Protein backbone atom coordinates (compact mmCIF):
# COMPACT_ATOMS: atom_id res chain seq x y z
CA UNK A 1 0.00 0.00 0.00
CA UNK A 2 0.90 3.68 0.25
CA UNK A 3 4.30 4.11 1.87
CA UNK A 4 4.25 5.66 5.34
CA UNK A 5 8.00 5.95 6.10
CA UNK A 6 7.66 3.66 9.11
CA UNK A 7 10.65 2.63 11.20
CA UNK A 8 11.33 -1.04 10.40
CA UNK A 9 11.74 -2.86 13.71
CA UNK A 10 10.14 -5.47 15.92
CA UNK A 11 7.39 -7.55 14.36
CA UNK A 12 7.29 -5.45 11.19
CA UNK A 13 10.95 -6.28 10.57
CA UNK A 14 10.48 -10.00 11.23
CA UNK A 15 7.44 -10.24 8.95
CA UNK A 16 8.97 -8.23 6.10
CA UNK A 17 12.24 -10.17 6.06
CA UNK A 18 10.55 -13.53 6.61
CA UNK A 19 8.33 -13.23 3.55
CA UNK A 20 11.13 -11.78 1.41
CA UNK A 21 12.94 -14.00 -1.06
CA UNK A 22 15.82 -11.56 -1.53
CA UNK A 23 17.25 -8.13 -0.83
CA UNK A 24 18.51 -5.66 -3.45
CA UNK A 25 21.18 -3.40 -1.93
CA UNK A 26 22.44 -0.09 -3.18
CA UNK A 27 26.15 0.22 -2.46
CA UNK A 28 27.45 3.74 -1.79
CA UNK A 29 25.98 5.18 1.40
CA UNK A 30 24.43 1.80 2.28
CA UNK A 31 27.24 -0.75 2.59
CA UNK A 32 30.07 1.78 2.92
CA UNK A 33 31.13 5.40 2.57
CA UNK A 34 34.53 5.60 0.90
CA UNK A 35 36.90 3.20 2.65
CA UNK A 36 34.68 3.01 5.77
CA UNK A 37 32.15 0.18 5.77
CA UNK A 38 28.84 0.66 7.55
CA UNK A 39 29.37 -1.27 10.82
CA UNK A 40 27.55 -4.59 10.68
CA UNK A 41 27.07 -4.61 6.91
CA UNK A 42 29.27 -7.69 6.25
CA UNK A 43 27.57 -9.65 9.04
CA UNK A 44 24.12 -8.81 7.65
CA UNK A 45 24.97 -10.30 4.26
CA UNK A 46 26.21 -13.48 5.96
CA UNK A 47 23.08 -13.93 8.08
CA UNK A 48 20.91 -13.17 5.04
CA UNK A 49 22.70 -15.92 3.12
CA UNK A 50 22.34 -18.45 5.95
CA UNK A 51 18.62 -17.60 6.05
CA UNK A 52 18.19 -18.54 2.38
CA UNK A 53 17.67 -14.92 1.33
CA UNK A 54 19.01 -13.91 -2.07
CA UNK A 55 21.14 -10.76 -2.32
CA UNK A 56 21.81 -8.55 -5.34
CA UNK A 57 23.63 -5.22 -5.57
CA UNK A 58 23.08 -2.06 -7.62
CA UNK A 59 25.16 1.10 -7.88
CA UNK A 60 25.25 4.13 -10.16
CA UNK A 61 29.01 4.32 -9.45
CA UNK A 62 30.88 3.65 -12.71
CA UNK A 63 34.41 3.86 -11.31
CA UNK A 64 34.99 0.09 -11.17
CA UNK A 65 34.21 -2.51 -13.78
CA UNK A 66 32.72 -5.74 -12.46
CA UNK A 67 36.10 -7.45 -11.78
CA UNK A 68 37.45 -4.58 -9.68
CA UNK A 69 34.09 -4.06 -7.97
CA UNK A 70 34.06 -7.70 -6.87
CA UNK A 71 37.60 -7.29 -5.53
CA UNK A 72 36.44 -4.23 -3.58
CA UNK A 73 33.66 -6.22 -1.90
CA UNK A 74 36.08 -8.98 -0.89
CA UNK A 75 38.74 -6.52 0.27
CA UNK A 76 36.33 -4.64 2.53
CA UNK A 77 35.15 -7.83 4.27
CA UNK A 78 32.13 -8.97 2.22
CA UNK A 79 32.81 -12.66 1.60
CA UNK A 80 31.04 -15.19 -0.57
CA UNK A 81 29.77 -12.78 -3.24
CA UNK A 82 30.01 -13.46 -6.97
CA UNK A 83 30.68 -10.83 -9.61
CA UNK A 84 27.47 -11.73 -11.45
CA UNK A 85 25.53 -10.38 -8.43
CA UNK A 86 26.87 -6.84 -9.02
CA UNK A 87 24.88 -4.50 -11.30
CA UNK A 88 26.56 -1.13 -11.77
CA UNK A 89 25.43 1.59 -14.15
CA UNK A 90 28.60 0.81 -16.12
CA UNK A 91 27.51 -2.80 -16.65
CA UNK A 92 23.96 -1.86 -17.65
CA UNK A 93 25.26 0.79 -20.06
CA UNK A 94 27.51 -1.78 -21.74
CA UNK A 95 24.57 -4.17 -22.10
CA UNK A 96 22.27 -1.56 -23.66
CA UNK A 97 24.99 -0.41 -26.06
CA UNK A 98 25.74 -4.02 -27.01
CA UNK A 99 22.03 -4.70 -27.54
CA UNK A 100 21.54 -1.57 -29.64
CA UNK A 101 24.82 -1.79 -31.59
CA UNK A 102 24.62 -5.52 -32.34
CA UNK A 103 24.28 -6.10 -36.07
CA UNK A 104 26.14 -6.73 -39.32
CA UNK A 105 29.90 -7.02 -38.70
CA UNK A 106 30.64 -4.37 -41.34
CA UNK A 107 28.39 -1.97 -39.34
CA UNK A 108 29.50 -2.16 -35.69
CA UNK A 109 30.67 1.39 -34.95
CA UNK A 110 32.39 2.94 -31.95
CA UNK A 111 31.27 4.47 -28.64
CA UNK A 112 32.47 7.93 -27.58
CA UNK A 113 32.73 7.77 -23.78
CA UNK A 114 32.71 10.71 -21.38
CA UNK A 115 33.93 8.75 -18.37
CA UNK A 116 36.77 6.99 -16.62
CA UNK A 117 38.83 3.89 -17.24
CA UNK A 118 36.56 1.59 -15.24
CA UNK A 119 33.64 2.54 -17.47
CA UNK A 120 35.76 2.10 -20.59
CA UNK A 121 36.86 -1.35 -19.39
CA UNK A 122 33.26 -2.45 -18.78
CA UNK A 123 32.31 -1.55 -22.35
CA UNK A 124 35.34 -3.38 -23.77
CA UNK A 125 34.36 -6.49 -21.80
CA UNK A 126 31.03 -6.41 -23.66
CA UNK A 127 32.75 -6.32 -27.07
CA UNK A 128 32.24 -2.61 -27.77
CA UNK A 129 34.77 -0.53 -29.70
CA UNK A 130 35.74 2.78 -28.09
CA UNK A 131 36.70 6.03 -29.77
CA UNK A 132 40.15 7.08 -28.60
CA UNK A 133 41.47 3.52 -28.30
CA UNK A 134 44.52 2.47 -30.34
CA UNK A 135 44.15 2.53 -34.11
CA UNK A 136 41.67 4.20 -36.43
CA UNK A 137 38.43 5.23 -34.76
CA UNK A 138 35.38 3.74 -36.51
CA UNK A 139 32.20 5.70 -37.05
CA UNK A 140 30.95 6.83 -33.66
CA UNK A 141 27.52 5.24 -33.26
CA UNK A 142 26.87 6.26 -29.65
CA UNK A 143 27.86 8.81 -27.02
CA UNK A 144 27.93 7.59 -23.42
CA UNK A 145 27.92 10.14 -20.58
CA UNK A 146 29.18 8.92 -17.22
CA UNK A 147 31.01 10.29 -14.18
CA UNK A 148 33.82 12.11 -15.99
CA UNK A 149 36.57 13.66 -13.86
CA UNK A 150 38.17 14.85 -17.13
CA UNK A 151 35.02 16.62 -18.37
CA UNK A 152 35.99 19.61 -20.48
CA UNK A 153 34.45 22.13 -22.84
CA UNK A 154 36.35 20.63 -25.78
CA UNK A 155 35.15 17.08 -25.09
CA UNK A 156 31.62 18.37 -24.53
CA UNK A 157 31.98 20.04 -27.93
CA UNK A 158 33.28 16.78 -29.41
CA UNK A 159 30.39 14.73 -28.00
CA UNK A 160 27.84 17.16 -29.45
CA UNK A 161 29.54 17.05 -32.85
CA UNK A 162 28.95 13.29 -32.89
CA UNK A 163 25.34 13.85 -31.81
CA UNK A 164 24.62 16.03 -34.86
CA UNK A 165 24.21 12.64 -36.56
CA UNK A 166 20.62 11.75 -35.55
CA UNK A 167 21.46 8.03 -35.80
CA UNK A 168 24.14 8.40 -33.10
CA UNK A 169 22.65 7.24 -29.80
CA UNK A 170 22.91 9.19 -26.55
CA UNK A 171 23.17 7.15 -23.35
CA UNK A 172 23.79 8.23 -19.76
CA UNK A 173 24.81 5.94 -16.92
CA UNK A 174 22.59 7.78 -14.42
CA UNK A 175 21.15 11.16 -13.43
CA UNK A 176 22.61 11.47 -9.92
CA UNK A 177 23.13 15.24 -9.52
CA UNK A 178 26.08 15.10 -7.10
CA UNK A 179 27.93 12.79 -4.72
CA UNK A 180 29.33 13.32 -1.22
CA UNK A 181 33.01 12.80 -0.48
CA UNK A 182 34.77 11.82 2.73
CA UNK A 183 35.89 15.39 3.49
CA UNK A 184 32.30 16.71 3.44
CA UNK A 185 32.66 18.31 0.01
CA UNK A 186 30.61 17.26 -3.01
CA UNK A 187 31.41 16.23 -6.57
CA UNK A 188 29.11 16.73 -9.58
CA UNK A 189 27.36 13.59 -10.79
CA UNK A 190 26.52 12.20 -14.21
CA UNK A 191 23.19 14.03 -14.06
CA UNK A 192 24.95 17.39 -14.18
CA UNK A 193 27.15 16.38 -17.11
CA UNK A 194 24.20 14.76 -18.90
CA UNK A 195 22.23 18.00 -18.55
CA UNK A 196 25.06 19.81 -20.35
CA UNK A 197 25.25 17.24 -23.15
CA UNK A 198 21.47 17.07 -23.55
CA UNK A 199 21.11 20.86 -23.57
CA UNK A 200 23.91 21.53 -26.05
CA UNK A 201 22.80 18.71 -28.38
CA UNK A 202 19.04 19.15 -28.04
CA UNK A 203 18.71 15.42 -27.33
CA UNK A 204 17.12 13.26 -24.65
CA UNK A 205 19.45 10.63 -23.22
CA UNK A 206 18.61 6.99 -22.65
CA UNK A 207 19.29 6.45 -18.93
CA UNK A 208 20.17 2.95 -17.73
CA UNK A 209 20.82 3.50 -14.03
CA UNK A 210 18.29 3.66 -11.23
CA UNK A 211 15.66 5.08 -10.96
CA UNK A 212 15.41 4.02 -14.62
CA UNK A 213 13.60 0.65 -14.84
CA UNK A 214 16.25 -0.61 -17.29
CA UNK A 215 18.60 -1.36 -14.38
CA UNK A 216 16.02 -3.81 -13.03
CA UNK A 217 15.56 -5.29 -16.51
CA UNK A 218 19.29 -6.07 -16.53
CA UNK A 219 18.84 -7.96 -13.26
CA UNK A 220 15.79 -9.91 -14.43
CA UNK A 221 17.66 -10.92 -17.60
CA UNK A 222 20.08 -12.89 -15.39
CA UNK A 223 18.00 -13.81 -12.32
CA UNK A 224 14.41 -14.76 -11.55
CA UNK A 225 13.40 -11.93 -9.21
CA UNK A 226 9.87 -11.54 -7.87
CA UNK A 227 9.74 -7.77 -7.17
CA UNK A 228 6.85 -8.21 -4.71
CA UNK A 229 9.16 -10.44 -2.63
CA UNK A 230 12.28 -8.25 -2.97
CA UNK A 231 13.37 -5.48 -0.61
CA UNK A 232 15.03 -2.43 -2.18
CA UNK A 233 17.47 -0.91 0.33
CA UNK A 234 19.01 2.45 -0.53
CA UNK A 235 20.10 5.80 0.86
CA UNK A 236 18.83 8.22 -1.81
CA UNK A 237 15.13 9.04 -2.09
CA UNK A 238 15.25 10.39 -5.65
CA UNK A 239 17.10 7.33 -7.03
CA UNK A 240 16.86 4.22 -4.83
CA UNK A 241 13.37 4.71 -3.39
CA UNK A 242 11.81 5.92 -6.65
CA UNK A 243 13.50 2.92 -8.29
CA UNK A 244 11.83 0.53 -5.86
CA UNK A 245 8.38 2.02 -6.37
CA UNK A 246 8.67 1.88 -10.16
CA UNK A 247 9.68 -1.80 -9.97
CA UNK A 248 7.03 -2.79 -7.42
CA UNK A 249 9.45 -3.54 -4.57
CA UNK A 250 9.17 -2.79 -0.87
CA UNK A 251 11.49 0.15 -0.23
CA UNK A 252 13.71 0.68 2.81
CA UNK A 253 15.62 3.93 3.34
CA UNK A 254 18.85 3.71 5.33
CA UNK A 255 20.09 6.92 6.96
CA UNK A 256 23.84 6.27 6.58
CA UNK A 257 23.95 8.10 3.24
CA UNK A 258 22.56 10.99 1.22
CA UNK A 259 18.90 11.31 2.18
CA UNK A 260 17.50 12.18 5.61
CA UNK A 261 14.36 11.14 7.44
CA UNK A 262 13.22 14.78 7.31
CA UNK A 263 13.49 14.79 3.51
CA UNK A 264 11.47 11.57 3.34
CA UNK A 265 8.74 12.86 5.67
CA UNK A 266 8.61 16.06 3.60
CA UNK A 267 7.75 14.00 0.52
CA UNK A 268 4.99 12.19 2.43
CA UNK A 269 3.40 15.43 3.63
CA UNK A 270 3.42 16.64 0.01
CA UNK A 271 1.75 13.43 -1.19
CA UNK A 272 4.65 12.53 -3.50
CA UNK A 273 3.95 8.86 -3.15
CA UNK A 274 6.76 7.39 -5.27
CA UNK A 275 9.47 9.24 -3.28
CA UNK A 276 8.29 8.08 0.17
CA UNK A 277 10.08 5.00 1.58
CA UNK A 278 7.84 2.22 2.86
CA UNK A 279 10.22 1.73 5.80
CA UNK A 280 13.41 3.27 7.18
CA UNK A 281 16.33 2.18 9.37
CA UNK A 282 19.18 4.08 11.00
CA UNK A 283 21.56 1.65 9.29
CA UNK A 284 21.20 -1.69 7.53
CA UNK A 285 22.69 -3.26 10.67
CA UNK A 286 19.26 -2.72 12.23
CA UNK A 287 17.92 -5.36 9.82
CA UNK A 288 19.80 -8.17 11.59
CA UNK A 289 17.19 -8.19 14.37
CA UNK A 290 14.75 -9.80 11.92
CA UNK A 291 16.96 -12.87 11.40
CA UNK A 292 17.69 -15.89 13.60
CA UNK B 1 46.30 -46.78 12.88
CA UNK B 2 43.32 -47.18 10.56
CA UNK B 3 42.16 -50.72 9.82
CA UNK B 4 39.67 -50.27 6.93
CA UNK B 5 36.81 -51.91 8.81
CA UNK B 6 33.35 -52.43 7.36
CA UNK B 7 31.12 -49.85 9.05
CA UNK B 8 27.90 -51.54 10.14
CA UNK B 9 25.62 -52.16 13.09
CA UNK B 10 26.41 -50.43 16.37
CA UNK B 11 29.71 -49.02 15.09
CA UNK B 12 27.79 -47.27 12.32
CA UNK B 13 25.25 -45.85 14.78
CA UNK B 14 28.00 -44.62 17.11
CA UNK B 15 30.09 -43.08 14.31
CA UNK B 16 27.18 -41.26 12.68
CA UNK B 17 25.65 -40.27 16.01
CA UNK B 18 28.79 -38.52 17.25
CA UNK B 19 29.44 -36.71 13.96
CA UNK B 20 28.37 -33.09 13.51
CA UNK B 21 28.62 -33.28 9.72
CA UNK B 22 29.68 -35.30 6.70
CA UNK B 23 32.11 -34.10 4.03
CA UNK B 24 31.29 -35.88 0.76
CA UNK B 25 33.42 -36.20 -2.30
CA UNK B 26 31.20 -35.98 -5.36
CA UNK B 27 32.38 -38.01 -8.36
CA UNK B 28 32.32 -41.74 -7.63
CA UNK B 29 30.46 -41.17 -4.34
CA UNK B 30 27.17 -39.43 -5.11
CA UNK B 31 27.10 -40.36 -8.81
CA UNK B 32 29.01 -41.82 -11.74
CA UNK B 33 28.42 -39.74 -14.84
CA UNK B 34 24.69 -39.11 -15.11
CA UNK B 35 23.80 -42.16 -12.97
CA UNK B 36 23.34 -41.37 -9.28
CA UNK B 37 24.45 -43.90 -6.67
CA UNK B 38 21.15 -45.54 -5.59
CA UNK B 39 20.04 -44.17 -2.24
CA UNK B 40 22.35 -41.14 -2.30
CA UNK B 41 19.52 -38.55 -2.37
CA UNK B 42 17.71 -40.31 0.48
CA UNK B 43 20.88 -40.35 2.58
CA UNK B 44 21.25 -36.57 2.30
CA UNK B 45 17.60 -36.15 3.28
CA UNK B 46 17.98 -38.31 6.39
CA UNK B 47 21.25 -36.58 7.28
CA UNK B 48 19.44 -33.23 7.12
CA UNK B 49 16.52 -34.52 9.21
CA UNK B 50 19.06 -35.68 11.82
CA UNK B 51 20.65 -32.24 12.12
CA UNK B 52 23.86 -33.36 10.41
CA UNK B 53 25.76 -30.74 8.44
CA UNK B 54 26.73 -31.65 4.88
CA UNK B 55 29.53 -30.18 2.78
CA UNK B 56 30.84 -31.29 -0.60
CA UNK B 57 34.32 -31.33 -2.10
CA UNK B 58 35.44 -32.18 -5.62
CA UNK B 59 38.63 -31.86 -7.63
CA UNK B 60 36.42 -31.55 -10.71
CA UNK B 61 37.19 -28.11 -12.16
CA UNK B 62 34.70 -28.30 -15.03
CA UNK B 63 31.65 -26.69 -13.37
CA UNK B 64 31.33 -23.33 -11.64
CA UNK B 65 29.28 -23.20 -8.45
CA UNK B 66 25.93 -22.27 -10.09
CA UNK B 67 26.10 -25.10 -12.63
CA UNK B 68 27.25 -27.56 -9.96
CA UNK B 69 24.26 -26.58 -7.81
CA UNK B 70 21.99 -27.13 -10.81
CA UNK B 71 23.54 -30.58 -11.29
CA UNK B 72 22.66 -31.64 -7.74
CA UNK B 73 19.02 -30.59 -8.16
CA UNK B 74 18.72 -32.06 -11.66
CA UNK B 75 19.92 -35.44 -10.35
CA UNK B 76 17.52 -35.45 -7.39
CA UNK B 77 19.47 -33.76 -4.56
CA UNK B 78 17.09 -31.07 -3.27
CA UNK B 79 17.54 -28.38 -0.65
CA UNK B 80 21.28 -27.86 -1.05
CA UNK B 81 23.04 -24.49 -1.02
CA UNK B 82 25.79 -23.33 -3.37
CA UNK B 83 27.79 -22.31 -0.29
CA UNK B 84 28.05 -26.03 0.58
CA UNK B 85 29.94 -26.82 -2.65
CA UNK B 86 33.75 -26.61 -2.67
CA UNK B 87 35.30 -27.52 -6.02
CA UNK B 88 38.97 -27.14 -6.91
CA UNK B 89 37.88 -24.40 -9.32
CA UNK B 90 36.36 -22.36 -6.49
CA UNK B 91 39.35 -22.80 -4.17
CA UNK B 92 41.77 -22.00 -6.99
CA UNK B 93 39.91 -18.74 -7.65
CA UNK B 94 40.12 -17.82 -3.95
CA UNK B 95 43.85 -18.55 -3.69
CA UNK B 96 44.67 -16.50 -6.79
CA UNK B 97 42.65 -13.55 -5.47
CA UNK B 98 44.52 -13.60 -2.15
CA UNK B 99 47.96 -14.00 -3.73
CA UNK B 100 47.28 -11.31 -6.35
CA UNK B 101 45.79 -8.86 -3.82
CA UNK B 102 45.87 -7.94 -9.57
CA UNK B 103 47.00 -8.67 -13.11
CA UNK B 104 45.58 -11.37 -15.34
CA UNK B 105 45.55 -15.16 -15.13
CA UNK B 106 46.41 -17.43 -18.05
CA UNK B 107 44.06 -20.40 -17.65
CA UNK B 108 44.70 -23.87 -19.06
CA UNK B 109 41.17 -25.11 -18.52
CA UNK B 110 37.53 -24.97 -19.51
CA UNK B 111 34.75 -22.42 -19.33
CA UNK B 112 33.58 -23.52 -15.89
CA UNK B 113 37.04 -22.86 -14.46
CA UNK B 114 37.26 -19.48 -16.21
CA UNK B 115 33.76 -18.59 -15.00
CA UNK B 116 34.73 -19.41 -11.42
CA UNK B 117 37.74 -17.09 -11.62
CA UNK B 118 35.65 -14.32 -13.17
CA UNK B 119 33.11 -14.65 -10.36
CA UNK B 120 35.89 -13.92 -7.84
CA UNK B 121 36.87 -10.70 -9.63
CA UNK B 122 39.95 -11.99 -11.46
CA UNK B 123 40.76 -10.94 -15.02
CA UNK B 124 41.70 -13.66 -17.50
CA UNK B 125 44.24 -13.48 -20.31
CA UNK B 126 42.44 -13.68 -23.63
CA UNK B 127 39.28 -11.94 -22.43
CA UNK B 128 37.94 -9.01 -24.45
CA UNK B 129 39.63 -5.65 -24.18
CA UNK B 130 41.90 -5.43 -21.17
CA UNK B 131 45.40 -6.87 -21.71
CA UNK B 132 46.98 -6.88 -18.24
CA UNK B 133 50.37 -8.33 -17.39
CA UNK B 134 49.97 -12.07 -16.82
CA UNK B 135 50.70 -12.60 -13.12
CA UNK B 136 49.69 -16.26 -12.80
CA UNK B 137 49.25 -19.46 -14.80
CA UNK B 138 46.47 -21.79 -13.65
CA UNK B 139 46.48 -25.43 -14.76
CA UNK B 140 43.15 -27.23 -14.58
CA UNK B 141 41.37 -29.99 -16.49
CA UNK B 142 42.01 -28.72 -20.02
CA UNK B 143 40.57 -30.71 -22.91
CA UNK B 144 42.10 -28.03 -25.18
CA UNK B 145 45.64 -28.71 -23.92
CA UNK B 146 48.10 -28.34 -26.78
CA UNK B 147 51.79 -27.93 -27.53
CA UNK B 148 51.16 -24.29 -28.45
CA UNK B 149 49.23 -23.63 -25.23
CA UNK B 150 51.93 -25.34 -23.17
CA UNK B 151 54.51 -23.16 -24.93
CA UNK B 152 52.48 -20.04 -24.08
CA UNK B 153 52.22 -21.04 -20.42
CA UNK B 154 55.99 -21.47 -20.17
CA UNK B 155 56.63 -18.09 -21.80
CA UNK B 156 54.61 -16.40 -19.05
CA UNK B 157 56.46 -18.48 -16.44
CA UNK B 158 59.81 -17.07 -17.60
CA UNK B 159 58.76 -14.14 -15.42
CA UNK B 160 59.76 -15.35 -11.92
CA UNK B 161 56.97 -13.21 -10.44
CA UNK B 162 54.32 -15.10 -12.45
CA UNK B 163 52.69 -17.61 -10.11
CA UNK B 164 52.03 -21.24 -11.05
CA UNK B 165 48.87 -22.81 -9.63
CA UNK B 166 47.21 -26.17 -10.29
CA UNK B 167 43.64 -27.09 -9.38
CA UNK B 168 44.65 -30.65 -8.41
CA UNK B 169 47.08 -33.47 -9.18
CA UNK B 170 44.59 -36.22 -10.05
CA UNK B 171 46.50 -38.26 -12.67
CA UNK B 172 43.43 -39.55 -14.53
CA UNK B 173 39.66 -39.92 -14.26
CA UNK B 174 37.39 -42.84 -15.16
CA UNK B 175 34.57 -42.58 -17.67
CA UNK B 176 31.34 -44.56 -17.88
CA UNK B 177 32.66 -46.88 -20.60
CA UNK B 178 35.61 -47.95 -18.43
CA UNK B 179 38.07 -45.80 -20.37
CA UNK B 180 40.10 -43.03 -18.76
CA UNK B 181 40.88 -39.38 -19.44
CA UNK B 182 44.11 -37.64 -18.36
CA UNK B 183 43.74 -35.55 -15.22
CA UNK B 184 45.06 -32.16 -14.19
CA UNK B 185 48.02 -33.88 -12.55
CA UNK B 186 49.27 -35.03 -15.95
CA UNK B 187 49.01 -31.55 -17.48
CA UNK B 188 50.57 -29.93 -14.41
CA UNK B 189 53.50 -32.35 -14.65
CA UNK B 190 54.12 -31.16 -18.22
CA UNK B 191 53.90 -27.48 -17.27
CA UNK B 192 56.11 -27.95 -14.20
CA UNK B 193 58.72 -29.89 -16.18
CA UNK B 194 58.87 -27.49 -19.13
CA UNK B 195 59.01 -24.40 -16.90
CA UNK B 196 61.25 -25.80 -14.16
CA UNK B 197 58.64 -24.65 -11.62
CA UNK B 198 56.71 -26.34 -8.83
CA UNK B 199 52.99 -25.59 -8.80
CA UNK B 200 50.87 -24.52 -5.86
CA UNK B 201 48.13 -27.17 -5.64
CA UNK B 202 44.79 -26.22 -4.09
CA UNK B 203 42.79 -29.42 -4.44
CA UNK B 204 42.69 -32.38 -2.09
CA UNK B 205 44.84 -33.95 -0.71
CA UNK B 206 46.29 -30.43 -0.41
CA UNK B 207 45.18 -28.86 2.90
CA UNK B 208 44.20 -25.59 1.20
CA UNK B 209 40.90 -27.16 0.15
CA UNK B 210 40.09 -27.58 3.84
CA UNK B 211 41.22 -24.03 4.63
CA UNK B 212 38.65 -22.85 2.09
CA UNK B 213 35.98 -24.78 4.01
CA UNK B 214 37.01 -23.58 7.47
CA UNK B 215 37.08 -19.96 6.28
CA UNK B 216 33.35 -20.30 5.52
CA UNK B 217 32.21 -22.79 8.19
CA UNK B 218 33.11 -23.74 11.74
CA UNK B 219 34.09 -27.38 11.15
CA UNK B 220 35.47 -29.63 13.88
CA UNK B 221 37.57 -32.13 11.87
CA UNK B 222 37.47 -34.60 14.77
CA UNK B 223 33.66 -34.70 14.43
CA UNK B 224 33.53 -34.81 10.62
CA UNK B 225 33.30 -37.87 8.37
CA UNK B 226 35.30 -37.61 5.14
CA UNK B 227 33.55 -39.85 2.60
CA UNK B 228 35.34 -40.48 -0.69
CA UNK B 229 36.11 -43.05 -3.34
CA UNK B 230 39.80 -42.30 -4.03
CA UNK B 231 42.48 -43.35 -1.55
CA UNK B 232 45.25 -41.05 -2.81
CA UNK B 233 43.08 -37.90 -2.69
CA UNK B 234 39.99 -38.25 -0.49
CA UNK B 235 41.39 -40.54 2.20
CA UNK B 236 44.82 -38.89 2.40
CA UNK B 237 42.97 -35.57 2.56
CA UNK B 238 40.92 -36.78 5.52
CA UNK B 239 43.98 -38.01 7.41
CA UNK B 240 45.87 -34.75 6.87
CA UNK B 241 42.88 -32.77 8.18
CA UNK B 242 42.26 -35.03 11.17
CA UNK B 243 38.91 -36.37 9.97
CA UNK B 244 37.46 -39.86 10.23
CA UNK B 245 37.74 -41.36 6.75
CA UNK B 246 35.19 -43.60 5.03
CA UNK B 247 35.98 -45.25 1.69
CA UNK B 248 33.04 -46.02 -0.57
CA UNK B 249 33.47 -48.69 -3.25
CA UNK B 250 31.26 -47.12 -5.95
CA UNK B 251 34.21 -45.27 -7.48
CA UNK B 252 37.90 -45.36 -8.28
CA UNK B 253 39.59 -47.21 -5.43
CA UNK B 254 39.01 -50.83 -4.44
CA UNK B 255 39.00 -52.52 -1.05
CA UNK B 256 42.07 -54.49 -2.16
CA UNK B 257 44.00 -51.28 -2.83
CA UNK B 258 43.05 -50.05 0.65
CA UNK B 259 44.03 -53.34 2.30
CA UNK B 260 47.26 -53.23 0.29
CA UNK B 261 48.09 -49.88 1.90
CA UNK B 262 47.30 -51.30 5.35
CA UNK B 263 49.65 -54.22 4.68
CA UNK B 264 52.39 -51.79 3.59
CA UNK B 265 52.00 -49.57 6.66
CA UNK B 266 50.92 -46.48 4.69
CA UNK B 267 48.68 -45.18 7.48
CA UNK B 268 47.67 -41.94 5.79
CA UNK B 269 46.26 -43.87 2.82
CA UNK B 270 44.29 -46.45 4.85
CA UNK B 271 40.59 -45.59 5.36
CA UNK B 272 39.29 -45.86 8.89
CA UNK B 273 36.08 -47.46 7.60
CA UNK B 274 34.61 -48.60 4.29
CA UNK B 275 31.18 -49.18 2.79
CA UNK B 276 30.06 -50.79 -0.45
CA UNK B 277 28.06 -47.62 -1.13
CA UNK B 278 27.06 -44.57 0.88
CA UNK B 279 23.52 -45.99 0.98
CA UNK B 280 24.81 -48.44 3.60
CA UNK B 281 25.26 -45.44 5.91
CA UNK B 282 21.50 -44.83 6.10
CA UNK B 283 21.08 -47.69 8.59
CA UNK B 284 22.72 -45.60 11.33
CA UNK B 285 20.06 -42.88 11.04
CA UNK B 286 16.40 -42.79 12.05
O1 LIG C 1 30.56 6.97 -11.01
C1 LIG C 1 31.28 7.34 -10.08
C2 LIG C 1 30.76 7.67 -8.78
C3 LIG C 1 31.55 8.09 -7.77
C4 LIG C 1 31.12 8.41 -6.40
C5 LIG C 1 31.87 9.26 -5.61
C6 LIG C 1 31.48 9.54 -4.31
C7 LIG C 1 30.33 8.97 -3.79
C8 LIG C 1 29.58 8.13 -4.57
C9 LIG C 1 29.96 7.84 -5.87
O2 LIG C 1 32.90 8.24 -7.93
C10 LIG C 1 33.49 7.95 -9.14
C11 LIG C 1 34.87 8.13 -9.23
O3 LIG C 1 35.58 8.57 -8.16
C12 LIG C 1 35.50 7.85 -10.44
O4 LIG C 1 36.84 8.02 -10.55
C13 LIG C 1 34.76 7.40 -11.53
C14 LIG C 1 33.39 7.22 -11.43
C15 LIG C 1 32.74 7.50 -10.23
MG1 LIG D 1 23.77 5.33 -2.62
MG1 LIG E 1 35.89 -39.08 -6.42
Numbering used by the authors:
A (entry chain A): 0 to 291
B (entry chain B): 1 to 101, 107 to 291
Source paper text:
Pyridoxal 5’-phosphate phosphatase (PDXP), an enzyme that controls levels of pyridoxal 5’-phosphate (PLP), the co-enzymatically active form of vitamin B6, may represent an alternative therapeutic entry point into vitamin B6-associated pathologies. PDXP is a member of the large family of haloacid dehalogenase (HAD)-type hydrolases. HAD phosphatases are Mg2+-dependent phospho-aspartate transferases that consist of a Rossman-like catalytic core linked to a cap domain.
7,8-DHF-bound murine PDXP co-crystallized with phosphate in the cubic space group I23, with protomer A containing the inhibitor and protomer B representing an inhibitor-free state. 7,8-DHF was observed to only bind to one subunit (the A-chain) of murine PDXP with well-defined density and full occupancy since its average B-factor of 45.8 Å2 closely matches the B-factors of the surrounding atoms. Binding to the other subunit (B-protomer) is prevented by a salt bridge between Arg62 and Asp14 of a symmetry-related A-protomer in the crystal. However, preventing mPDXP salt bridge formation by mutating Asp14 to Ala did not alter the efficacy of 7,8-DHF inhibition (see also Figure 3d for the characterization of the PDXP-Arg62Ala variant). Due to the limited solubility of 7,8-DHF, we were unable to address the stoichiometry of 7,8-DHF binding to the PDXP dimer with isothermal calorimetry. It is conceivable that the mPDXP crystal packing is very stable (indeed, 7,8-DHF-bound mPDXP crystallized in the same cubic space group as apo-mPDXP, see Kestler et al., 2014, including the aforementioned salt bridge between Arg62 of the B-subunit and Asp14 of a symmetry-related molecule), and that the free energy generated by the formation of the crystal lattice is higher than the free energy generated upon inhibitor binding. The Cα atom-based alignment of the structures representing murine apo-PDXP and murine 7,8-DHF-bound PDXP resulted in root mean square (RMS) deviations in the range of 0.43–0.71 Å. The inhibitor localization in the presence of phosphate was identical in human and murine PDXP. Inhibitor binding in the presence of phosphate is identical in human and murine PDXP and appears to be primarily stabilized by two hydrogen bonds, as well as polar and non-polar interactions.
